[PDB]
Structure 1
């Protein structure tokens, strides 16, 4: 019985608080009070329409064939205005909808299944999912979170442990390159890949003939932001404009560098294209802690499309040929590592051999360091990695790429003076210690912009410096003050994230507790009643579980990440796909299959609930006669785990065979059969460090490499003379090696003059910030 009034008419959803910093006035005051640098704002000319065939002559046929728009929009207007970037933050105080909704259906299903099943780990799984729903929130944070994040970046860069250039730490570019030959082994780009000698649009071959139509340019995310000067546009809306701007910037830089006044010309080009150094401060979508919603929002420094393209032309041809890591090469690098297809078992074999031989082990992946020492596994992360970066760290990376990557077999460069100018003299100051845009505020970026094309490379170099210093200090244990003292030594902040004790015993336990029943145990299509002990390496987010069926370790997503993903799944995040009938149900199937595939299969309660949900959806589709195989075959793009599990289809329900197939290695593994690094093959990181400590590798032997190192010390007014010193090697003239030797000697001699010594990175930053 209820009243007529009533008759007439699970954790609660998180509602973010009102954000007091959501206005330019309040945000600017907050930053001023916290002494965060706000730049004097710079203006961008309005857009002018130009004919595509005049601006991009190489693409005339594409315009004629109606495959490319006949006009391009470029910032050449008579009036210039200050740009404004207002990102959405969801959920927010006024809007708590489907975006960032926790999976309450899964929570109810986990509860129903726990009541029917006696899984000993079942109560803890339910408790963890409920706790993650109650304490976390998937979304794009807040203006307060973004602003507080900027303060933390400034604190890392300039606070307790101010940043140090590699030169202050005690490394020359050549010494760093010797370390990188070991920690980031690289191959040269393919001989058929064009050298760094051209305007980007010249790398497009279009005639209409499908058999030959090719682009030698890097691939791009079409739906991603164009960045400045095209706020609100995607890369798909602005590819022609990006080519025009990237061609103009490289062309103007090249002409200015060899002009009668290189300093005036180079500075003018940099000032005219200032916006190529300013990133849109995009709030990153993550599973944030509800109580810290306004205290921290991670940012993506959204690089201008032309800058992204020019930087990617230097890095991607090298990196595409350099998927060299500890599982296939004798290197600490984890670059290109996959724990699938036997990857985790190769890691476990290396770990087990190190433990058996009483050897220390180090692994590096960007801002992640892994140390095995004293029967303990340590996970060390750089503290807000990007904030530690100086333009000189990126310049050392450019030096490494141009000396070890962009080089011919005879030692001649695979670049001309224009590209050496962009790469060495300008590019590091475009994305490191430059600026970002939030609302109408042009803010200083402390360190490198997170998400720029060189993020991974720059972070990897910083971890390389920390590791080289660790080796130099006699490998102090990560839990000691001697290890923590490497922060001040390097100017790089870091923290011990994980300490996995009794490693040897943990591995024995993981093998012994491996279940006899279920997936990868006896190979049935059921989870184990009692999962075995995981080796919680958190190796790029992965733990290791022993398989009795396959007689190997296999990866499972680290528990906390698995629970967070189950509690707050990412939605479809594609309005076009979402409007197609069956895309939502297909995405729901994908979400439940992917959570099982990454590790849910080994969590009995989670596997039971997720299997039931995906089977129920498939059954409904079958009865209804609705075919979604198209979406299920091309599932990768609709899943946060899509990049992790390539080459598999979700059109058939997950079985033991799916788990066998994803873990199947192409080849057997022998760690002793791994090739040595392409450069200094016989040398180890320890031998290189010993050589450096003694004063070796200060200068490269190659005159071409000496010119490139001198390029990092000489002021911009010397660019025309530096171009003349490089022209013989760059043109591969007869006797270029002897000619380069004489020119590098003449240049080293003239460098005695201190008035010629100024970082072009400082000159670039000064020209970018000019008002």
Structure 2
């Protein structure tokens, strides 16, 4: 026995403990990340950490124990549903004689003790990329491989840690109260009417459909159930059935608690309305607020993201999981308006990017606007929640509010409520599409329920600094804050984003922000993108292959998208920003959709979806990534065909299972991705003429620049409409005045004969009584005080 293939001889100690200590490291494959043990994973350690860092911990409040009530007694409008056996005959409500302190313990995965399939990097793809690189002469191949391996080695998809969540809360407090403490719109210098005039341009809205119910009813009254499928309708917002119910139902989904949410939402709105018109509105309103304190406390859910391994315990984004009744009531105000307001820069003369999709010509419409602005030597601004985009001095600037939500004051949300109730919930005659009860909830209570309220982590009831990220108004409040920053930029004579004059806008507004991207020589970059467009492959000559040499991309990072010029379509098309593309390839999310995960059909289809989606979003233009992902999806498809396993239904309706499912609803993945798929996703319904875009619904002819100029002159301090004047006065008057405020609104709300004249007289009357400083107190402060009572 001579020349036998060597086998590793090791000590019995090594053998016993299965040690790889001696073994040669395969630098081609990164080791799995194992999160450290978390020292802040106990209520004692977490509370001490927060105390040491001067973070406010509230005196804990208790929720009454659950009591069973008859569904038909609690929800009389749904008696028929109970009778038809379609709805449970009992509801579990917090009306007990005893009470409990709520506890929320979220799961953080992976963790020190569990490094499993959740958050696993795509090592199979890494191996496929490696092998395809050996077999193919792709000039961009080595860089693609390096990038995917580096993302696997440095990032981690998962739900962070308690330390990450706690450190994140500190960062939010610092944004809100630290270097640049928050400022209410009034402190900055804006009245609710002045802000509404800016929002008419930055966030154009339409009124809800005339057939949509006004804000006059208890939520359950918007449910019409008879049994007749043709007439059965809910006029309420839609909900994510598998999402958390929030307080007072920890561990339950919205699906398990819809009847309970309706009972609680009905009760809160009913009690509030009665209290407001009672003999003592202050005592009654404060009692209702205290009784339903839990409707203002969000479960501090750790957000799943592709975090950096080194900053695993330094930063974990949180989702402020709003109580289902609060969510329902807030959504009743925002959704009917927003559903009718998908107005953005591609379809309306507005800087708004609300409802934007880069697909179906969207990216090309943006590129046309960018090119025209560059040609006409004009500045350009675009706004999307906490994202600001500025085109000035042949440069594309991406400005993001620093931890956006943390900059929010209840007054910012109150101004948004004013905008929605004046511009949205209004009839053609100027009369309100709401009653005093709804104006009370919307204007006086709602902003202090989700802004500067509280959250729950473990058994700790913690202060929330700013607005709760994930609440129904997150986008709207963030968009209003960006509007203030942009308005201040215009006022300051449009200082370049790289200057101190631009950075000084942080103090002027009390809103923290940072320049995230500076894309220099824009005009030249766009020219290069067109010139370098390949003649070969997908969207070039139409063949089902990636280009040998991909063209230059205009790296706008416009809501995560870059632009590529297509010779076949003679237009710019979106491709997911490189860094996001690589991170999604390295750390794919799993089947993260309800019970869907238990459906073998969905689980199986997902494995194909996962690779098809990575190709669709931009992988198609990365020769190595397209080659490997195509191979993998085809292999999976072939196994199914050979085995006779049908998942076509899940492949057709794939959108629900992919982080990329948005907008791409009309595309099907039952057939493999081809050049047609790419043509289809990029096909516009209509040709584009920027000059043909309709102007904003309100103040059409006016631009944001014109409105800013008017505001600096002291214009729009007060609305002309008496109905609107009453709503602005509502923001200044203390809760004890609610019964009298209800009387001032009743004529316009009831649309009585001569309501307009009556309202004018009542508004002037109210205006006079507001000369008494004793009557002047923010109901938002009164709400917070009542919510925090023990």
TM-score range, shorter chain: over 0.9
How far did 1:3 drift? Answer: 8.2
Contact 2:652 2:670 in 1 (8 A): yes
Q: Which residue of 2 aligns with 1:482?
A: 501
- Work out the CA distance in 1 between the residues paired with 2:396 and 2:176: 28
1:204-231 CA distance string (max 9 Å, x none): 0000100010000000000000000000
1: distance between equivalents of 2:600 and 2:245?
Answer: 30
Instruction: Give aligned pairs, total.
Output: 771
Deviates more, 1:637-646 or 1:129-138: 637-646
**Could you tell me how far 1:633 is from its partner in structure 2?**
1.1
Do the aligned partners of residues 237 and 520 (structure 1) sit closer, same or farther apart at CA in structure 2, a change above 3 Å counting?
same
Unaligned runs of 5+ in 1: none
How much does 1:435 deviate? 0.2
Runs of 4+ in 1 over 4 A off after TM superposition: 1-9
Q: Tell me the SS of whatever aligns to 2:171.
A: helix
Between the aligned partners of 1:411 and 1:582, the Cα distance in structure 2 is: 53
Q: CA RMSD in A?
A: 1.1
Structure 2 Cα separation of the partners of residues 14 and 2 of structure 1: 27
Give the 5 Å matches for 1:467-506. 467-506=486-525
Give the gaps of 5 or more residues in structure 2: 1-8, 18-28
| 1:8 aligns to 2:16 (yes or no) | yes
SS in 1 for 2:646: coil
- Paired with 2:767 and 2:204, the residues of 1 have a C-alpha distance of 29
Work out the CA distance in 2 between the residues paired with 1:188 and 1:460. Answer: 19
Alpha-carbon distance change, 738 to 103 in structure 1, aligned in 2, over 3 angstroms: same
Q: Higher mean Cα deviation, 493-502 or 571-580?
A: 571-580
Task: Give the 3-state SS of the residue equivalent to 1:498 in structure 2.
Answer: strand
Pick closer, same or farther for the CA change 1:250–1:579 going to 2, 3 Å: closer
| Structure 1 pair 4–266 and aligned structure 2 pair: CA distance change class (3 A) | closer
Residue number in structure 2 paired with 1:135: 154
What are the Cα deviations for residues 522-563 of structure 1, in whole angstroms up to 9, with x where unaligned?
010000011000000000000000000000000000000000
1:213 match: 232
Q: Deviation per CA, 1:101-120, whole angstroms, max 9, x where unpaired?
A: 00000000000111111111
Cα distance per residue 1:70-95 (max 9 Å; x no partner): 10000001111110000000000010
User: What SS does structure 2 have at the residue aligned with 1:27?
Assistant: helix
Residue 664 of structure 2 aligns to a residue in which SS? coil
Deviation at 1:576, TM superposition (A): 3.5
Q: Which has the larger displacement, 113-122 or 270-279?
A: 113-122
Change in CA separation of 1:588 and 1:685 when aligned onto 2, cut-off 3 Å: same
For residues 355-395 of structure 1, what are the alpha-carbon distances to aligned partners after superposition, in whole Å with 9 as ceiling and x for unaligned?
00000000000000000000000000000000000000000
Cα deviation, 1:495-537, whole Å, max 9, x if unaligned, reads: 0000000000000000000000000000100000110000000
**Matches of 1:740 and 1:462 in 2, distance apart?**
32
State the Cα distance separating 1:582 from its structure 2 match. Answer: 4.3
C-alpha separation between the residues in 2 aligned to 1:442 and 1:628?
45
- Matched residue of 2:774: which SS? helix
The 2-side partners of 1:211 and 1:704 are apart by 38
SS of 1:572's equivalent in the other structure is coil
**TM-score calculated relative to the size of structure 1:** 0.99
Distance in 2, matches of 1:368 and 1:584, equals 35
SS in 2 for 1:371: strand
TM-score of the pair, normalised by structure 2: 0.97
C-alpha separation in 1, matches of 2:14 and 2:763:
90
Following superposition, the deviation at residue 647 of structure 1 comes to 1.4
Q: For residue 573 of structure 1, report the CA deviation from its aligned partner.
A: 2.8
Q: Aligned equivalents of 1:446 and 1:310: distance in 2?
A: 22
Task: Give the whole-Å Cα distance in 1 for the aligned partners of 2:188 and 2:598.
Answer: 55
Q: CA deviation at 1:642?
A: 1.2
Is the partner of 1:300 in helix, strand or coil?
strand
Please list the CA deviations of residues 95-142 of structure 1 after superposition, one character each: whole Å capped at 9, or x if unmatched. 000000000000000001111111111100000000000000000000
User: Structure 1 688/8 Cα, relative in aligned 2: closer, same or farther at 3 Å?
Assistant: closer
- CA 1:768–1:515 in structure 2 vs 1: closer, same or farther (change >3 Å)? same
- How far does residue 626 in structure 1 lie from its aligned partner after superposition? 1.0
Deviations along 1:643-699, one digit per CA (max 9) or x if unpaired, are: 242211110000000000000000000000000000000000000000000000000
How many Å separate the matches in 2 of 1:294 and 1:186? 41
Shift of the alpha carbon at 1:577?
Answer: 3.1
After TM superposition, give the deviation of residue 418 of structure 1 in Å: 0.1
Work out whether residues 593 and 656 of structure 2, in 8 Å CA contact, stay in contact via their aligned partners in 1: no
- 1:303-335 C-alpha deviation (Å, 9 max, x unpaired): 000000000000000000000000000000000
Given the superposition, is the C-alpha separation of residues 486 and 7 from structure 1 closer, same or farther in structure 2, using an over 3 Å criterion?
closer
The 2-side partners of 1:739 and 1:413 are apart by 14
Residues 1:460 and 1:602: Cα distance change in structure 2 (over 3 Å) = same
Give the drift of 1:467: 0.1
In 1, the alpha carbon distance for the partners of 2:651 and 2:468 equals 35
Deviation by residue 1:213-259 (Cα, 9 ceiling, x = unmatched): 00000000000000000000000000000000000000000000000
Contact 2:196 2:415 in 1 (8 A): yes
1:687 aligns to what?
A: 706
Q: Does structure 1 retain, via aligned residues, the 8 Å contact 2:381–2:390?
A: yes
**Cα deviation, residue 637, structure 1:** 1.4
- DSSP-derived class of the 1:436 partner: strand
Task: Quote the offset at 1:437 in angstroms.
Answer: 0.2
Kindly provide the CA deviation profile for residues 395-424 of structure 1, in whole angstroms up to 9, marking residues without a partner as x.
000000000000000000000000000000
1:583 deviates by 3.3
